Amino acid sequence: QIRQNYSTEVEAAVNRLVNLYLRASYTYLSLGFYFDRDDVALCGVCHFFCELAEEKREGAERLLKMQNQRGGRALFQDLQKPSQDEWGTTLDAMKAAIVLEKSLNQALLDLHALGSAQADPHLCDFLESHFLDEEVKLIKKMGDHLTNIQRLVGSQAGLGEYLFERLTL
Amino acid sequence: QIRQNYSTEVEAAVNRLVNLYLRASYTYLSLGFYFDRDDVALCGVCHFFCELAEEKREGAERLLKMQNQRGGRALFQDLQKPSQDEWGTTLDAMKAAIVLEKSLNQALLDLHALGSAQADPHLCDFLESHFLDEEVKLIKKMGDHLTNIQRLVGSQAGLGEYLFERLTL
Amino acid sequence: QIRQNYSTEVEAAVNRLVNLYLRASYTYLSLGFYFDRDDVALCGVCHFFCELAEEKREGAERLLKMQNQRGGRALFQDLQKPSQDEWGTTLDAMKAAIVLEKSLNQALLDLHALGSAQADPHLCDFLESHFLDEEVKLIKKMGDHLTNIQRLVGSQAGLGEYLFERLTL
Amino acid sequence: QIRQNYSTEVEAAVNRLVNLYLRASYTYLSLGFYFDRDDVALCGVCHFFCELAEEKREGAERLLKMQNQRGGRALFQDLQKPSQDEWGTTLDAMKAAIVLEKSLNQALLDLHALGSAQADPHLCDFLESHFLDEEVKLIKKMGDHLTNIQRLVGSQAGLGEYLFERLTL
Ligand SMILES: [Au+]
Ligand SMILES: [Au+]
Ligand SMILES: [Au+]
Ligand SMILES: [Au+]
Ligand SMILES: [Au+]
Ligand SMILES: [Au+]
Ligand SMILES: [Au+]
Ligand SMILES: [Au+]
Ligand SMILES: [Au+]
Ligand SMILES: [Au+]
Ligand SMILES: [Au+]
Ligand SMILES: [Au+]
Ligand SMILES: [Au+]
Ligand SMILES: [Au+]
Ligand SMILES: [Au+]
Ligand SMILES: [Au+]
Ligand SMILES: [Au+]
Ligand SMILES: [Au+]
Ligand SMILES: [Au+]
Ligand SMILES: [Au+]
Ligand SMILES: [Au+]
Ligand SMILES: [Au+]
Ligand SMILES: [Au+]
Ligand SMILES: [Au+]
Ligand SMILES: [Au+]
Ligand SMILES: [Au+]
Ligand SMILES: [Au+]
Ligand SMILES: [Au+]
Ligand SMILES: [Au+]
Ligand SMILES: [Au+]
Ligand SMILES: [Au+]
Ligand SMILES: [Au+]
Ligand SMILES: [Au+]
Ligand SMILES: [Au+]
Ligand SMILES: [Au+]
Ligand SMILES: [Au+]
Ligand SMILES: [Au+]
Ligand SMILES: [Au+]
Ligand SMILES: [Au+]
Ligand SMILES: [Au+]
């Protein structure tokens, strides 16, 4: 028995956070392939979301690895399908991405608060080292992208959307 | 005692010019971080101003080194905070930069005139070699940037501001 | 809007800590050039303080970068001139440096305490990763230097001050 | 006839400055060999003065080359023997060196003033580029050395003189 100072509440919440990361991954997969549609055709947007799908999956895998290291038991649930089948414009897609990220970030912070109430400093090191800083960086990048996309809407929206994909993504 | 042909008036004016260079450096620091804001998000503008902050600091350090070489005494004053907290558009920011540069250039020229009236040819060599030519080059570059920014304003200002940052900076 | 779990109190305190780092940087600049005076002439002491000026500036820049990442707004104040124009002996200068460092360290710890009361684990990761350990290391080094400088004072102070600069710095 | 805008007064003064540089060179030669005496035996001091002898000779040669370039006629006088046969301590020797340098520097400045009164901008470029900055640097270095030598005198003069030669020169 390896398990030590690892509460059942943390264990459960780690499994939920794994589910949220895989759901996010799945969302990004759907975002990526939407932008690869012949009638959408924004290669850079596709590559941005595909890369995020992978990062989110890796996140989940690190949580699972940590679950096992602490002697908790990974439990998997259904992955709920993404919230939309079609994601609109690059602007709409980037808004939906940042609301998704803010929800993951909130779940990370709820998990940190739970680890403080439970006195679980390994969990706290774990989240700090691999999640908190990265999520903040990602959200700042998405904010930056959103400000440039918005700046490019104005009167010529198609033009702005093309330029952004070519010169930023 | 090393001091030779170095007037108290030059000495004072060198300390003031050091203060002006560090103030300029501090202005550029504030300009750079304004453009790094998530709601401004113009990476190239940030990098242009950050680089200038550093060049201005180096300027100040060279003046200090020269002060010591002539046997004057460096005296430091408060660095006054930059003239604005938010710098508006890239156009506004580049105008404010060039007025700042013109003020440094005028201070350089007042110092040269003072060195001529005092018969201080080392000071004159010093300013010529490291300051006068560089300030002229920088101001010409900023003028060029300002003309391209203005050319890009027209009807689609957001578009122009994005393009300038991507294709020039 | 990227800002999430980032209090106005943390935001303010980050801006103040930036000011303290830049002030420290400016102090070290003045310490460095004092030791470069022809009538002081302690090259190693100059290089030690110059390097510190740079580290302190970098500190400030990292805080600013973090401010932007969390969606706070950087606000700059006057940089107050250093507490002295002439810094006495290497011993006096190293004492003044360590009191300065202890004040920065205290400000770092007040900021950590504020981040705990506000439940801001990103801020806590941030300070731990880049500031707390480094400040402790620096202070230990300065303590070591101070003990060797003091050991060298005794009867022949000029000799001790020369040796320290040649064989340690 | 190449000569253009080159006064007879500048020409004469260039020949005198050549004589001063060669005299200085000769002084340094004598300083160097004094420190190589078996009863003085300060290798680093010898190497410092030997190097200066060479720099001063090079100075003279550059002046001669410039004399010819402007179509003036080099005229050589006796080189007066150095002011002393024995140079005392490293402290005494470094004082005598800096008075010598200050005299060369004054002659450089008198020549610049003469070139301004004569409207001879080539002469002014010439002195600025190769002489003024270098003489200031050298004098600052000698001042630094003098401050460290003085710091090392105190009670144990022999010790201080040995250490300076080993750890600085
Ligand atoms: Au894709
Ligand atoms: Au793709
Ligand atoms: Au993909
Ligand atoms: Au935590
Ligand atoms: Au904890
Ligand atoms: Au914690
Ligand atoms: Au913790
Ligand atoms: Au984004
Ligand atoms: Au995006
Ligand atoms: Au990107
Ligand atoms: Au920047
Ligand atoms: Au930047
Ligand atoms: Au920067
Ligand atoms: Au001048
Ligand atoms: Au002049
Ligand atoms: Au001049
Ligand atoms: Au001149
Ligand atoms: Au510019
Ligand atoms: Au510009
Ligand atoms: Au540029
Ligand atoms: Au320094
Ligand atoms: Au230095
Ligand atoms: Au420095
Ligand atoms: Au904390
Ligand atoms: Au905390
Ligand atoms: Au904490
Ligand atoms: Au913590
Ligand atoms: Au220290
Ligand atoms: Au020290
Ligand atoms: Au050290
Ligand atoms: Au020699
Ligand atoms: Au020698
Ligand atoms: Au020799
Ligand atoms: Au001249
Ligand atoms: Au002239
Ligand atoms: Au001149
Ligand atoms: Au001139
Ligand atoms: Au010397
Ligand atoms: Au010397
Ligand atoms: Au030397």
From Swiss-Prot, chains A, B, C, D:
Any Gene Ontology CC annotation: autophagosome
Gene Ontology molecular function, alphabetical: ferric iron binding; ferrous iron binding; iron ion binding
Region feature Catalytic site for iron oxidation, mapped onto this chain: 51-58
Binding site for Fe cation: 51, 54-55, 58, 61
Compartment(s) where it occurs, according to its Swiss-Prot or TrEMBL record: Cytoplasmic vesicle, Autophagosome; Cytoplasm; Autolysosome
Pfam families, sorted: Ferritin
The Ferritin-like diiron domain, residue ranges: 4-153
Top-level taxon of the source organism: Eukaryota
Keyword tags: Acetylation, Cytoplasm, Cytoplasmic vesicle, Iron, Iron storage, Lysosome, Metal-binding
Subunit structure: Oligomer of 24 subunits. There are two types of subunits: L (light) chain and H (heavy) chain. The major chain can be light or heavy, depending on the species and tissue type. The functional molecule forms a roughly spherical shell with a diameter of 12 nm and contains a central cavity into which the insoluble mineral iron core is deposited. Interacts with NCOA4.
General function of this protein: Stores iron in a soluble, non-toxic, readily available form. Important for iron homeostasis. Iron is taken up in the ferrous form and deposited as ferric hydroxides after oxidation. Also plays a role in delivery of iron to cells. Mediates iron uptake in capsule cells of the developing kidney. Delivery to lysosomes by the cargo receptor NCOA4 for autophagic degradation and release or iron.
PANTHER family in alphabetical order: FERRITIN (PTHR11431), FERRITIN LIGHT CHAIN (PTHR11431:SF47)
Further facts: In horse spleen the light chain is the major chain.
Protein family membership: Belongs to the ferritin family.
Protein name per Swiss-Prot or TrEMBL: Ferritin light chain
